[PDB]
Design a protein around this ligand. Structure first.
Ligand SMILES: [K+]
Ligand SMILES: [Mg+2]
Ligand SMILES: [Mg+2]
Ligand SMILES: [Mg+2]
Ligand SMILES: [Mg+2]
Ligand SMILES: [Mg+2]
Ligand SMILES: [Mg+2]
Ligand SMILES: [Mg+2]
Ligand SMILES: [Mg+2]
Ligand SMILES: [Mg+2]
Ligand SMILES: [Mg+2]
Ligand SMILES: [Mg+2]
Ligand SMILES: [Mg+2]
Ligand SMILES: [Mg+2]
Ligand SMILES: [Mg+2]
Ligand SMILES: [Mg+2]
Ligand SMILES: [Mg+2]
Ligand SMILES: [Mg+2]
Ligand SMILES: [Mg+2]
Ligand SMILES: [Mg+2]
Ligand SMILES: [Mg+2]
Ligand SMILES: [Mg+2]
Ligand SMILES: [Mg+2]
Ligand SMILES: [Mg+2]
Ligand SMILES: [Mg+2]
Ligand SMILES: [Mg+2]
Ligand SMILES: [Mg+2]
Ligand SMILES: [Mg+2]
Ligand SMILES: [Mg+2]
Ligand SMILES: [Mg+2]
Ligand SMILES: [Mg+2]
Ligand SMILES: [Mg+2]
Ligand SMILES: [Mg+2]
Ligand SMILES: [Mg+2]
Ligand SMILES: [Mg+2]
Ligand SMILES: [Mg+2]
Ligand SMILES: [Mg+2]
Ligand SMILES: [Mg+2]
Ligand SMILES: [Mg+2]
Ligand SMILES: [Mg+2]
Ligand SMILES: [Mg+2]
Ligand SMILES: [Mg+2]
Ligand SMILES: [Mg+2]
Ligand SMILES: [Mg+2]
Ligand SMILES: [Mg+2]
Ligand SMILES: [Mg+2]
Ligand SMILES: [Mg+2]
Ligand SMILES: [Mg+2]
Ligand SMILES: [Mg+2]
Ligand SMILES: [Mg+2]
Ligand SMILES: [Mg+2]
Ligand SMILES: [Mg+2]
Ligand SMILES: [Mg+2]
Ligand SMILES: [Mg+2]
Ligand SMILES: [Mg+2]
Ligand SMILES: [Mg+2]
Ligand SMILES: [Mg+2]
Ligand SMILES: [Mg+2]
Ligand SMILES: [Mg+2]
Ligand SMILES: [Mg+2]
Ligand SMILES: [Mg+2]
Ligand SMILES: [Mg+2]
Ligand SMILES: [Mg+2]
Ligand SMILES: [Mg+2]
Ligand SMILES: [Mg+2]
Ligand SMILES: [Mg+2]
Ligand SMILES: [Mg+2]
Ligand SMILES: [Mg+2]
Ligand SMILES: [Mg+2]
Ligand SMILES: [Mg+2]
Ligand SMILES: [Mg+2]
Ligand SMILES: [Mg+2]
Ligand SMILES: [Mg+2]
Ligand SMILES: [Mg+2]
Ligand SMILES: [Mg+2]
Ligand SMILES: [Mg+2]
Ligand SMILES: [Mg+2]
Ligand SMILES: [Mg+2]
Ligand SMILES: [Mg+2]
Ligand SMILES: [Mg+2]
Ligand SMILES: [Mg+2]
Ligand SMILES: [Mg+2]
Ligand SMILES: [Mg+2]
Ligand SMILES: [Mg+2]
Ligand SMILES: [Mg+2]
Ligand SMILES: [Mg+2]
Ligand SMILES: [Mg+2]
Ligand SMILES: [Mg+2]
Ligand SMILES: [Mg+2]
Ligand SMILES: [Mg+2]
Ligand SMILES: [Mg+2]
Ligand SMILES: [Mg+2]
Ligand SMILES: [Mg+2]
Ligand SMILES: [Mg+2]
Ligand SMILES: [Mg+2]
Ligand SMILES: [Mg+2]
Ligand SMILES: [Mg+2]
Ligand SMILES: [Mg+2]
Ligand SMILES: [Mg+2]
Ligand SMILES: [Mg+2]
Ligand SMILES: [Mg+2]
Ligand SMILES: [Mg+2]
Ligand SMILES: [Mg+2]
Ligand SMILES: [Mg+2]
Ligand SMILES: [Mg+2]
Ligand SMILES: [Mg+2]
Ligand SMILES: [Mg+2]
Ligand SMILES: [Mg+2]
Ligand SMILES: [Mg+2]
Ligand SMILES: [Mg+2]
Ligand SMILES: [Mg+2]
Ligand SMILES: [Mg+2]
Ligand SMILES: [Mg+2]
Ligand SMILES: [Mg+2]
Ligand SMILES: [Mg+2]
Ligand SMILES: [Mg+2]
Ligand SMILES: [Mg+2]
Ligand SMILES: [Mg+2]
Ligand SMILES: [Mg+2]
Ligand SMILES: [Mg+2]
Ligand SMILES: [Mg+2]
Ligand SMILES: [Mg+2]
Ligand SMILES: [Mg+2]
Ligand SMILES: [Mg+2]
Ligand SMILES: [Mg+2]
Ligand SMILES: [Mg+2]
Ligand SMILES: [Mg+2]
Ligand SMILES: [Mg+2]
Ligand SMILES: [Mg+2]
Ligand SMILES: [Mg+2]
Ligand SMILES: [Mg+2]
Ligand SMILES: [Mg+2]
Ligand SMILES: [Mg+2]
Ligand SMILES: [Mg+2]
Ligand SMILES: [Mg+2]
Ligand SMILES: [Mg+2]
Ligand SMILES: [Mg+2]
Ligand SMILES: [Mg+2]
Ligand SMILES: [Mg+2]
Ligand SMILES: [Mg+2]
Ligand SMILES: [Mg+2]
Ligand SMILES: [Mg+2]
Ligand SMILES: [Mg+2]
Ligand SMILES: [Mg+2]
Ligand SMILES: [Mg+2]
Ligand SMILES: [Mg+2]
Ligand SMILES: [Mg+2]
Ligand SMILES: [Mg+2]
Ligand SMILES: [Mg+2]
Ligand SMILES: [Mg+2]
Ligand SMILES: [Mg+2]
Ligand SMILES: [Mg+2]
Ligand SMILES: [Mg+2]
Ligand SMILES: [Mg+2]
Ligand SMILES: [Mg+2]
Ligand SMILES: [Mg+2]
Ligand SMILES: [Mg+2]
Ligand SMILES: [Mg+2]
Ligand SMILES: [Mg+2]
Ligand SMILES: [Mg+2]
Ligand SMILES: [Mg+2]
Ligand SMILES: [Mg+2]
Ligand SMILES: [Mg+2]
Ligand SMILES: [Mg+2]
Ligand SMILES: [Mg+2]
Ligand SMILES: [Mg+2]
Ligand SMILES: [Mg+2]
Ligand SMILES: [Mg+2]
Ligand SMILES: [Mg+2]
Ligand SMILES: [Mg+2]
Ligand SMILES: [Mg+2]
Ligand SMILES: [Mg+2]
Ligand SMILES: [Mg+2]
Ligand SMILES: [Mg+2]
Ligand SMILES: [Mg+2]
Ligand SMILES: [Mg+2]
Ligand SMILES: [Mg+2]
Ligand SMILES: [Mg+2]
Ligand SMILES: [Mg+2]
Ligand SMILES: [Mg+2]
Ligand SMILES: [Mg+2]
Ligand SMILES: [Mg+2]
Ligand SMILES: [Mg+2]
Ligand SMILES: [Mg+2]
Ligand SMILES: [Mg+2]
Ligand SMILES: [Mg+2]
Ligand SMILES: [Mg+2]
Ligand SMILES: [Mg+2]
Ligand SMILES: [Mg+2]
Ligand SMILES: [Mg+2]
Ligand SMILES: [Mg+2]
Ligand SMILES: [Mg+2]
Ligand SMILES: [Mg+2]
Ligand SMILES: [Mg+2]
Ligand SMILES: [Mg+2]
Ligand SMILES: [Mg+2]
Ligand SMILES: [Mg+2]
Ligand SMILES: [Mg+2]
Ligand SMILES: [Mg+2]
Lengths: 275, 48
RNA sequence: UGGGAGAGGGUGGUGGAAUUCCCGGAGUAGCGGUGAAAUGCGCAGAUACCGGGAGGAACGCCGAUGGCGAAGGCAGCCACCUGGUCCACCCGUGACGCUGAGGCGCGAAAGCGUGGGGAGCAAACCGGAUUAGAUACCCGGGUAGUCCACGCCCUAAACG
RNA sequence: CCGAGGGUAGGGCCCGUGACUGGGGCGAAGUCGUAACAAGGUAGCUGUACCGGAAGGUGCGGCUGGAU
RNA sequence: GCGGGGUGGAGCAGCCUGGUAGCUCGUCGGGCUCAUAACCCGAAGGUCGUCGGUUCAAAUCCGGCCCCCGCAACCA
RNA sequence: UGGUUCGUGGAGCCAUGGGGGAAUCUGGGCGGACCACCGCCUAAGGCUAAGUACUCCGGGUGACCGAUAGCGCACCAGUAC
RNA sequence: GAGCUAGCCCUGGCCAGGGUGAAGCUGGGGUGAGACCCAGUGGAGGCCCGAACCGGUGGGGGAUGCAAACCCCUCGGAUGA
RNA sequence: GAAUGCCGGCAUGAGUAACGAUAAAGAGGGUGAGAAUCCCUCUCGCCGUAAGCCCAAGGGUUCCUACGCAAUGGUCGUCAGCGUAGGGUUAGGCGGGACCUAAGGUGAAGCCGAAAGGCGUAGCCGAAGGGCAGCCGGUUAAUAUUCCGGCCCUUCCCGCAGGUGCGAUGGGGGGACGCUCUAGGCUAGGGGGACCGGAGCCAUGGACGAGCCCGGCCAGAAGCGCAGGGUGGGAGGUAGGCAAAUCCGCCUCCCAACAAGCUCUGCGUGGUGGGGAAGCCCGGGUGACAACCCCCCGAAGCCAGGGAGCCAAGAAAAGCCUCUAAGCACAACCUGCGGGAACCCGUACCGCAAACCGACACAGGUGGGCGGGUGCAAGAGCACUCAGGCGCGCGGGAGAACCCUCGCCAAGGAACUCUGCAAGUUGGCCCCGUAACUUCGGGAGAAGGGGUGCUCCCUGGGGUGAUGAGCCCCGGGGAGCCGCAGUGAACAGGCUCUGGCGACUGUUUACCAAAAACACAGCUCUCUGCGAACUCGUAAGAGGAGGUAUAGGGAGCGACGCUUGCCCGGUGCCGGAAGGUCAAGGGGAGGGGUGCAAGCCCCGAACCGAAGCCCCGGUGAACGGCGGCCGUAACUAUAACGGUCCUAAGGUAGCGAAAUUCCUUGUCGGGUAAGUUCCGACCUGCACGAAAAGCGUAACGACCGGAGCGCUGUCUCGGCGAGGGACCCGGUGAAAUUGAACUGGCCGUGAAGAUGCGGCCUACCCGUGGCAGGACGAAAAGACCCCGUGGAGCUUUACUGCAGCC
RNA sequence: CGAUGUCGGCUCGUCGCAUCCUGGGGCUGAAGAAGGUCCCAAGGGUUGGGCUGUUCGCCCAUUAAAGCGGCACGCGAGCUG
């Protein structure tokens, strides 16, 4: 569920917060966290390269295990489910029989106290990771590698998932969260199940401050600027666009496709995305 | 009101200091220029 | 106590025909639609045919004037959870009954909110016909919605 | 002390009245179409939704108070 | 101050590119109908805002006048 | 593309970022597209004084200045400020 | 040149007192179970009043100023973007 | 001789403005050539969440003392932050370094770039973060956690003894973390005391008092006590913690578990060492053998790594502990004890200011800590006042106009004015009471009203004690008293009704606009499959993001409610292995130059040939667009209806003389005695209309209209009073401006607005306080306007290029 | 154009007379009263409000009357804005 508030302040009227039902531990594993270096949207030249960023709550980065084929055949116990500020998902603490402790992003329905395992011979059950070829077609899957051994790159956001559509040679056909149909190598690992915390998208920030807490600084319309700043700048009083709607940098921003046509991965993308 | 000059000894030496000048081509040129002019001080005085 | 029939309800699964779309192959000059046509689609290779995929919705034959339910209503198949109901035995309790202002629940379709889903169908809308006109009936398209979950709405030729 | 009542302030109900507005009812022979009654020339009616000069039309469901 | 317009009864062609006034509706006459409308068959009706000039010839080209609608009128 | 007087010009020469890519004197470059003849020269390694430029420094000399001039400074000036 | 100023980064610090009384929890009522209602407890909030502090709304004064933006009275925010 | 020329000198304004907060002075006595100004005393006033004290920045000798007064000091000066000289800053424990990391910087390796250079993992550097051992008092003119006194403690080195598998930049634990609220116990701090100590005091009517005034502590090792933080023990297995490991991690077992124990801090006590007032005798002596106790209040500070709740999920690295590896086990480490060793820099003084930033001894600006008492509900608010610090570095008079700040006003009560601008009114707390409407929170402090002091009697519950007295915290009821008035002073909302805009809290034009603008949660479009898109960069490399379509970029719109119509012809974007065009290149029908020739060389048609464009489609919460004339109803008027021209399509719902209405003060209603505004209507909307959103909307607003109530000096309409100025005297003494001046009125004239010309009129010479009509007064080489083949910002389907992209 | 501050308001006047009232008149379609119209007359006077920034104007309530003009659309080193 998602938690609502009474309108006892204007902002509290619409604000909703996560229910945190699945969270069983309220501090992270000290050895599995490093300090996150806030950027403020600045790159190594000290230049804003992504606008409207900074000032959000301090965060500690939880090291996430996006490989899992490290520990093939070694099962683990789902010891806890915790809060991670760096992603939309929840993260599950694993205590391996190995003694090793790692984080994975927590899949939906995954339960504290259960066992999980990785490998070709692993059971087809939630929280287990296998290479795609050994997973039944039509099964829902998340945290999918894009290339073998390169790390889980796909369907990692809260509520996201991919579906295996079929097989073609050394490649399988996935339906990514975007709806795009794609050829992913068979030897790519993925976890059966969907990413948990599906109710994430039902969160209503409620007020400006909530945006600031997230390190999302105020976004200012080009229309509100001057011609020096932005193609939509200027005009006496309000103005319509007066040209094709565009970015500050002048390129068109309504429909203008921008992926490189000659991209080598185009051979592996069967169908462009959905809606 | 609050004015523009807010003395700070560390800031002075770190910005205009001799070692700062030397670290950069333009700053060395400053030192060169100031030496050629016969400046009695090449770099602002600051008490460390 | 023993037994029966049933689309009664809810949950999860799952099967084939068909429609559409997409890919591949073969193939050519029309297909489609109608009262007749036009729009539309089609040499940028459509229609018709075979193979491949994806997906959604509805369950043909059984099927009946049939069965279930208090009504609204309920139909591929499997399993799990559950209501009502009939019969038989003549075993138990002994009027514990009937109705029911209010209350409370259920309530087709359409509609509404937040998500998902969207093949076919289709308000609105567009176009082509018809026509004096045609904001219609017919035709080519087409958005809500139809579908799912949760929450509302609580109307009806809710009729026997 | 209580106290008719006067005063101050804010409420409740009722009645009259108001530029304008909304449909309604009636009004011998007004304009437009022809929706319903015979399969009324698209069977009707209907709850709801959307639309249109108007009757009305269309969608989804329902009913026969419809078929011959 | 600037543009466009005026033509059978109504609305629009023709003007640019001189000679040839046309389309739809309306109006009249006849049909069908019990009758009207629709529909069908025929027919009329303009001499082109007005005056002038060019031309062999002016709706058409040029000029003036009446008109008819639009647009402008800023710096203070 | 650059250099030369040469700004695409009939544009050779010299230099070279890219593609193709020889020969060793019967080899090769040049003589202003090109070709023939007549000639000039010997690429793709390097070094080389002197004659030339300059004046921080020393000296010599002015139809140079003479303290608002002459150097920003005749003086404790790249100072005080 | 970011010792002013604008943003961001890292590490610290500050915010008197009062007011309001969300969720939750408990108890009670309710029901087949519920939803729900009550009371207490609780102490939420770009919540309220108001200093520090951050502002600079209206007015007056100042105007070769106390000041190249100041003074008085007033007023905004004051657990938060 | 002029360049608003340049440098300098000196005038004018002028003995003029001013002499820098209106916190405030007076007298006596000193000093001295000279004193309102320096010193001393007394009186007065001001600050006291500072205007007192401490610390950090910054400043740099300004500190102390002596001797001085030319200049500095807005006057004066004998004084000084001034001149000259002398003296002054003392640390193993405070701060910083010989420790650690943070952002960032730098940078082995490495990567990149014409050069200069840019990057970059480890490492290093880098602090107000972490870590780390000193507290009290005395002393100097001037330093003190630094010197001295007492009581403590840290590191390093060596030696001794006991113990031990010792050993690290390696492993592991730990360090180690937010915000709000908050328990228990303490302290800091405070109040009271009939107790204890203390010079004295009896005034002026009373008081020899259980009277007044003063003070009644501070530091302290081990130990003990109180309160609290931290921590389970044992074994077996082990495959992870890049080697190892007995450690940590994981599994299993037993024992026990808001206990205890062990450990670590705070606090109290504590051997000991200190300190100690008023008053009157000259910073000192005394008081004093000072006493040094009880009760109460009590932190935001301490135990502190406490607890709870919450979502936005809250540094690192060392010190430290543990583990093992090389090694090594004569070593080595641990523990205790002893001795020795312990360096560098800062240390003065100012430090909300006269020593810092502001050119000034400048009403400005400047981070942290302490900041007492009484009362007012509280408090850091407010008034007074302690400690302490000040009266602001020109004065003395006078008592005009006028200005500032201030107080009061009869009758009226907004009639003032663009505006109730400004100023009134209201004003805290307790109680009673409180409407439309609403998103059920609110609107609410709505409105509106009552209460408020003091004295006596009775009484209820709590904290601390003990369950009690005393102290302290909330109270409740009686009966009374005084005043014009009881939150008696100070601080402390005026209210309401109704529209426009924006939902809301927020944000902005530093220094003329705070708004209706910006932001905003929310909505929708669009891009992006991850070496993402996009951004910065030549690049490498970064951001994006250690994120992955419930994510990220872009754009519009702007909570929420109900909605968001038709036009795809044009532009945009998206789709379209056809066709048309199309560059280099491929091709070489065919020519041409030259050569005696092979040959060399030049040109060259058809055809093949990419994107782009053309072309076929799609597309609006993409750029955008959403008609005209004419006729018709059994009165008129109007036109549901019809005809016709054009369009890509002809503006839907809603709303409308509007933040939009030209005509316009439209019309009609409302409110008013009167309403160019306002509110409500109407609709021929010059020129609304649906995400440059349309129409609504509770709540919110230092926004902008309109109205009423309250109340007022805004006004009728002005009067009086106060103080700071203006004025006089002493002191110091500017400025812009200035062709020179011996500088009148009228009517004329004149380049068209004359002190300056004409004629006339008027006029003794020179000032002071005032006024502002003129000197086309000052200031600023007009910012409007034009001009210039002047400049710059900005735009685009202007031109031509460049990046980027294809 | 090396600046002659620009509407209106306020304040302060002063002037002209084409006289709004008061005073003196002629003519009247002047019976009286009250008017109309002209002439002489500038001495004095010429109100307070609603609306607009408004000048002007309309409206309210009065009045003997509610005059029109000039003075840089009088007057910003007088003020307002
Ligand atoms: K202008
Ligand atoms: Mg909510
Ligand atoms: Mg969760
Ligand atoms: Mg760590
Ligand atoms: Mg860097
Ligand atoms: Mg840099
Ligand atoms: Mg960006
Ligand atoms: Mg940014
Ligand atoms: Mg999370
Ligand atoms: Mg955040
Ligand atoms: Mg924005
Ligand atoms: Mg702008
Ligand atoms: Mg810029
Ligand atoms: Mg631009
Ligand atoms: Mg624009
Ligand atoms: Mg506009
Ligand atoms: Mg604009
Ligand atoms: Mg554009
Ligand atoms: Mg791009
Ligand atoms: Mg795709
Ligand atoms: Mg300065
Ligand atoms: Mg410093
Ligand atoms: Mg510093
Ligand atoms: Mg610094
Ligand atoms: Mg430096
Ligand atoms: Mg020197
Ligand atoms: Mg220098
Ligand atoms: Mg073909
Ligand atoms: Mg029986
Ligand atoms: Mg019996
Ligand atoms: Mg339904
Ligand atoms: Mg229903
Ligand atoms: Mg009475
Ligand atoms: Mg019908
Ligand atoms: Mg009919
Ligand atoms: Mg019909
Ligand atoms: Mg019909
Ligand atoms: Mg019928
Ligand atoms: Mg119509
Ligand atoms: Mg229809
Ligand atoms: Mg029938
Ligand atoms: Mg023509
Ligand atoms: Mg012709
Ligand atoms: Mg008959
Ligand atoms: Mg007929
Ligand atoms: Mg002729
Ligand atoms: Mg003729
Ligand atoms: Mg003709
Ligand atoms: Mg202009
Ligand atoms: Mg040439
Ligand atoms: Mg050449
Ligand atoms: Mg040649
Ligand atoms: Mg080359
Ligand atoms: Mg050769
Ligand atoms: Mg050569
Ligand atoms: Mg040659
Ligand atoms: Mg030659
Ligand atoms: Mg040669
Ligand atoms: Mg050679
Ligand atoms: Mg030489
Ligand atoms: Mg000479
Ligand atoms: Mg000489
Ligand atoms: Mg000189
Ligand atoms: Mg000279
Ligand atoms: Mg020299
Ligand atoms: Mg000189
Ligand atoms: Mg110097
Ligand atoms: Mg900064
Ligand atoms: Mg700074
Ligand atoms: Mg508080
Ligand atoms: Mg509080
Ligand atoms: Mg609170
Ligand atoms: Mg607040
Ligand atoms: Mg403070
Ligand atoms: Mg102010
Ligand atoms: Mg005010
Ligand atoms: Mg002023
Ligand atoms: Mg100023
Ligand atoms: Mg001030
Ligand atoms: Mg406040
Ligand atoms: Mg001259
Ligand atoms: Mg001058
Ligand atoms: Mg003088
Ligand atoms: Mg003077
Ligand atoms: Mg001064
Ligand atoms: Mg002074
Ligand atoms: Mg003295
Ligand atoms: Mg002196
Ligand atoms: Mg001297
Ligand atoms: Mg002096
Ligand atoms: Mg002096
Ligand atoms: Mg001074
Ligand atoms: Mg002396
Ligand atoms: Mg010491
Ligand atoms: Mg050493
Ligand atoms: Mg370091
Ligand atoms: Mg570097
Ligand atoms: Mg450094
Ligand atoms: Mg440090
Ligand atoms: Mg220390
Ligand atoms: Mg100590
Ligand atoms: Mg060991
Ligand atoms: Mg941490
Ligand atoms: Mg919080
Ligand atoms: Mg406590
Ligand atoms: Mg006290
Ligand atoms: Mg192991
Ligand atoms: Mg190991
Ligand atoms: Mg003694
Ligand atoms: Mg505890
Ligand atoms: Mg804690
Ligand atoms: Mg680190
Ligand atoms: Mg040995
Ligand atoms: Mg040991
Ligand atoms: Mg050393
Ligand atoms: Mg010291
Ligand atoms: Mg301070
Ligand atoms: Mg000082
Ligand atoms: Mg002073
Ligand atoms: Mg000062
Ligand atoms: Mg108080
Ligand atoms: Mg003073
Ligand atoms: Mg006087
Ligand atoms: Mg009065
Ligand atoms: Mg009154
Ligand atoms: Mg008023
Ligand atoms: Mg006035
Ligand atoms: Mg105003
Ligand atoms: Mg007003
Ligand atoms: Mg008050
Ligand atoms: Mg009240
Ligand atoms: Mg009293
Ligand atoms: Mg108040
Ligand atoms: Mg209005
Ligand atoms: Mg706004
Ligand atoms: Mg606002
Ligand atoms: Mg703004
Ligand atoms: Mg501003
Ligand atoms: Mg500005
Ligand atoms: Mg400025
Ligand atoms: Mg202002
Ligand atoms: Mg504001
Ligand atoms: Mg908003
Ligand atoms: Mg929205
Ligand atoms: Mg770039
Ligand atoms: Mg990253
Ligand atoms: Mg906005
Ligand atoms: Mg907007
Ligand atoms: Mg509503
Ligand atoms: Mg279009
Ligand atoms: Mg199109
Ligand atoms: Mg288009
Ligand atoms: Mg639209
Ligand atoms: Mg267009
Ligand atoms: Mg429409
Ligand atoms: Mg209107
Ligand atoms: Mg308009
Ligand atoms: Mg108007
Ligand atoms: Mg009017
Ligand atoms: Mg009027
Ligand atoms: Mg009216
Ligand atoms: Mg107005
Ligand atoms: Mg009208
Ligand atoms: Mg728009
Ligand atoms: Mg729009
Ligand atoms: Mg509206
Ligand atoms: Mg509202
Ligand atoms: Mg406001
Ligand atoms: Mg007055
Ligand atoms: Mg006075
Ligand atoms: Mg002097
Ligand atoms: Mg003249
Ligand atoms: Mg003159
Ligand atoms: Mg003369
Ligand atoms: Mg003369
Ligand atoms: Mg004057
Ligand atoms: Mg003047
Ligand atoms: Mg100039
Ligand atoms: Mg000029
Ligand atoms: Mg100028
Ligand atoms: Mg001009
Ligand atoms: Mg010219
Ligand atoms: Mg130019
Ligand atoms: Mg001018
Ligand atoms: Mg002037
Ligand atoms: Mg001017
Ligand atoms: Mg008479
Ligand atoms: Mg008569
Ligand atoms: Mg007469
Ligand atoms: Mg007169
Ligand atoms: Mg007026
Ligand atoms: Mg005027
Ligand atoms: Mg007017
Ligand atoms: Mg009279
Ligand atoms: Mg005029
Ligand atoms: Mg004027
Ligand atoms: Mg002025
Ligand atoms: Mg004026
Ligand atoms: Mg103004």
């Amino acid at each position: 569920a998602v938690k609502k508030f009474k309108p006892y302040t204007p902002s509290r009227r619409f604000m909703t917060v996560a229910d945190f039902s699945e969270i069983t531990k309220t501090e992270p594993e000290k050895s599995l966290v490093k300090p996150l270096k806030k950027t403020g949207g600045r790159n190594n030249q000290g230049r804003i390269t992504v606008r409207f960023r900074g000032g959000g709550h301090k965060r500690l980065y939880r090291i996430i295990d996006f490989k899992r084929w490290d520990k093939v055949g070694i099962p683990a116990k789902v010891a806890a489910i915790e809060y991670d500020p760096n992603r939309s998902a929840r993260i599950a603490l694993l205590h391996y029989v190995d003694g090793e402790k790692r984080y994975i992003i927590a899949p939906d329905g995954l339960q504290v106290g259960q066992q999980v395992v990785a490998g070709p011979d692993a059971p087809i059950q939630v929280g287990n990771a296998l290479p795609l070829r050994f997973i039944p077609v039509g099964t829902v899957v998340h945290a999918v590698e894009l290339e073998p051994k390169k790390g889980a790159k796909l369907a990692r956001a809260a509520g996201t998932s991919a579906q295996i559509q079929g097989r073609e040679g050394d490649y399988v056909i996935l339906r990514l969260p975007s709806g795009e149909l794609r050829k992913v190598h068979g030897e790519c690992y993925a976890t059966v199940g969907a990413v948990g915390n599906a109710d994430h998208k039902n969160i209503v920030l409620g007020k400006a401050g909530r945006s600031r807490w997230l390190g999302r600084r105020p976004h200012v319309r080009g229309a509100a600027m001057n011609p020096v700043d932005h193609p939509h700048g200027g005009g006496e009083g309000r103005a319509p666009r007066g040209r094709p709607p565009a970015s500050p940098w002048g390129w068109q921003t309504k429909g203008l496709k921008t992926r490189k046509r000659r991209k080598p991965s185009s051979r592996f993308i069967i169908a462009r995305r959905k809606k | 009101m609050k004015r523009t000059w807010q003395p700070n000894r560390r800031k002075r030496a770190k910005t205009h200091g001799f070692r700062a000048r030397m670290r950069t081509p333009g700053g060395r040129k400053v030192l060169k220029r100031r030496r050629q002019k016969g400046r009695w001080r090449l770099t602002p005085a600051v008490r460390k």
